[PDB]
Symmetry: D2
Subunit: 294 residues, 4 copies
């Protein structure tokens, strides 16, 4: 039970921390020294390199930003050559299914049991150890992996074989974008026609218009004091990241010749938002398209 952890960013750091607090030994690596230092103070050893970290490890976990970086790091010279014997590889970044199926197959072509296990939840849930994993790959691996997932998270869904994790993640987050936008526009329509935001919200929440966002993440400021909207959209899940996910969803749709009118429109709208300088705001900042007075 010795782990290599590569990628200690907004999600990487707290996930790696919860693994330490669970009793695992970690070799961490990250392009950014202050991130390695964070985990070293919490009781991990820094590895000189991804390669180094991996040399000696039972399981290798990566949490990096996108497709490029992940394929880069696993795909020759690439660390995946240098990797290991009977080691469990857990690829938890959110990347394009194609990109994950490719990496999986190279895992196969080396006996390595790998899983794509993208995460849903946020920085707040990464810290609390309550994240949701969506996993492609063998039940074989999964069960070997479960004890780790349980340390970093709560709901563990087996979504299918190589790539299924990414597929479910992409599908889920696209629908999220849609209901969030749908929620922001509905919110602003009622308010503009005379309704009190909080009243309108509760009605739709308890009704057929009900959805995740209205439950826990209202885009309208004041409705939920605890939400990004009530603090001018700071923190939370970046608009820029949501756009990326939507981008991955487009990629999947084109492969399957799928039609995604709402998702694609949502994407178009998030890009507008990025034009308006909101890339680093919470994705609910999409509310600003409908309300000026903000």
């Amino acid at each position: 039970k010795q782990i290599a952890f590569i990628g200690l960013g907004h999600m990487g750091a707290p996930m790696a921390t919860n693994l330490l607090k669970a009793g695992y030994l970690l070799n961490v690596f990250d392009l950014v020294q202050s991130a390695v230092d964070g985990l070293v103070a919490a009781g991990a050893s820094a590895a000189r390199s991804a390669r180094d970290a991996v040399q000696g490890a039972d399981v290798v976990i990566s949490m990096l930003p996108a497709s490029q970086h992940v394929e880069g790091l696993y795909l020759d010279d690439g660390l995946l050559a240098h990797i290991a014997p009977g080691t469990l590889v857990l690829e938890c970044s959110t990347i394009a299914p194609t990109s994950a199926r490719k990496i999986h197959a190279a895992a196969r072509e080396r006996g390595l049991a790998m899983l794509d296990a993208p995460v849903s939840g946020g920085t707040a849930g990464a810290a609390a150890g309550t994240l949701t994993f969506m996993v492609g790959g063998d039940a074989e691996a999964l069960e070997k992996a479960r004890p780790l997932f349980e340390a970093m998270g709560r709901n563990i869904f087996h979504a299918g074989p190589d790539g299924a994790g990414q597929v479910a993640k992409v599908c889920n987050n696209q629908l999220l974008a849609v209901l969030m936008i749908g929620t922001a526009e509905a919110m602003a329509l009622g308010v503009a026609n005379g309704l009190e935001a909080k009243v309108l919200a509760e009605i739709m929440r308890r009704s057929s218009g009900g959805n995740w966002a209205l439950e826990v993440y209202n885009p309208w400021p004041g409705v939920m004091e605890n939400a990004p909207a009530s603090r001018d959209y700071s923190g939370g899940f970046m608009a820029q990241l949501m756009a990326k996910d939507l981008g991955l969803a487009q990629e999947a749709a084109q492969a399957s010749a799928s039609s995604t009118p709402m998702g694609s429109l949502a994407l178009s709208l998030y890009r507008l938002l990025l034009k308006q300088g909101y890339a680093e705001r919470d994705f609910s900042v999409v509310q600003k398209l409908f309300d000026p007075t903000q």
Copy 2:
């Protein structure tokens, strides 16, 4: 406690029936004799006319299909002249806010305490007495009215003053259209990329993509055996009616200069569906835009 009930259609009939089973005396009227006859056998007296029905009544309730009909019936000669003294008027049709604010004001201009109380739920909920009412108007009236609402329904929300009911209803149903379409496209994207429908569904339901439709009304056939989708989209809430509601939502948005990119797109898509001959199918038949093999 003598009621005039005008409009005994898919929703009207069971609502009027549950009022009888609650111990109210009703005078019912409907352009269609077999509908009056239904309620007469269950123990109501038929009224020769809307006017007749109303003559003698404490409260007048109407459940008609659209704006036209409702304004027609209340708006001169129109029955609203012939109406009553201290009688409670309950307008439960789903109509345009403008149209409801107009009628309210004429109620005012005659001392009549009126409420707009559109219903959410369906034929199944109208029968079970579990409907949701969304009410504009005075708390004054509302409390007088509550005992009736409780007989026909469960959740009773006071949404605001004259017209607020219609506003909340329109807002709610537009978001519904959006999440349902968003749900159908997401469902079909995952399936096309190799996922099992039922698996994908549960994941998104328990996750940030979660919504009313995934909870209780999955558009994908087989996922929920109890749903319209599992019986080729028969019964339920008509696609044609959803289009109407979306139409009312557009109306509200134009008055308030509101932007509704998702709702308007949803509308565009429902009209396509009507072109394909699906007007009388359940609104989840929207799933057919994404899946051919059906």
Copy 3:
């Protein structure tokens, strides 16, 4: 050949002026005194009222902003009662077809030969006498009317019977909104991928992407020095007015159960623009949604 002219706004004033410069006697009226005064100095008599203006007239022409005002002014007390015997009525405002068919029928119900003759072109074309008329009604009337249309305009299309004018206008302007937005997004895509605006423009203009906007009204600043875009979107055809027209198009679509995914989306986008404070800018200001650096 004595004319009553009611409505002397951005379009009304120059149209009425070109009628005077053609040798017609006018009785003008407008809620705004400085507008009547403009036409009085150019050689028209002010009428105390719409009614007054009309009393004595061979033909009555109106150029008002919307449906409300036009129905208001013609529809009882309403001036249409007070009107005339064998007088030609020319309704050149852009209003909803329904609204125009209603007015036409009241014209019928009084022997008055009326035409709906909405105008396409702008302030610049109203001044030059080069406007395009799109006419519903009888060939009978039309030919009687032609000499006036020729004085105020160039292309005169007979679009059909009562209401056809408005229908063609609405259809035309909706497609305009679409190609203009389509032009602005394409412009900004090429530029962002390294192309020179002017080069990209000429290519698409001469090619299958070619359209009115690229011919004469490029939304990209610098491409055409003569265009609103090259002068920060001042003057021209207001964004607010385009939104109104799109609104009328929605109205027509709902009556005919027509699907308008592009038009409706265009509408959604124009409303966003109005939220950003651009109501009084030229409709090509839609370019600002795609380009920040502006």
Copy 4:
């Protein structure tokens, strides 16, 4: 002046034929023997291979279906290694800019002067030698290349440096999709509100709604007897190919973080069309989304 021609499909065959009829010697190759045979009968020699064809050639021209195939054929073993000394390479397929910039750079890394020169026009224009080329690369190459372009085409635009051709093409065809859909929906709106198709068409063509499609490619059957629509959408430019182009446009937009609400919506709609079995119909078959009676 000896040419290697690789790819003799719908566009490849007639382009290669017009080069022969211009007095060039060709070595042709194609995975499909009947296509090589076509060009052999018209006076070309078949090459055993892409490689063979190229060995001996002054200029190498390729006209293949997509990104995959083109990168495949040029990108190692890949034919681009085996290629040539001071030979002119003309890559006329429509592929993703990224994909073209990559290939260009490998051309550089071997002294080979290459151009991306995607074609606009159709099978009919490929045959007539009237195609439009949109070219990225050096003026240097271009002028060397011009005499060939003139043999296969008419308008030759220099769109910029490496990749610009593809960029302009993608931008142009996305706007095309938009105006075509915009044209089909407008057509069907007017007809549904009582207008004669042909009348409505001419009005919008001569007016601000005017565009390429209305000029030469009306999607409404009967309007132009010469058009795909008048012969049930057979022949012309495939719906499936248009979807591909839209896909490439999405790719470019994501790289530049560009917003393309109309293009993306157009894409969503074309995919629906493919679901309905129309992949091999002319792209104007999009008209069928708005008109059932067809």
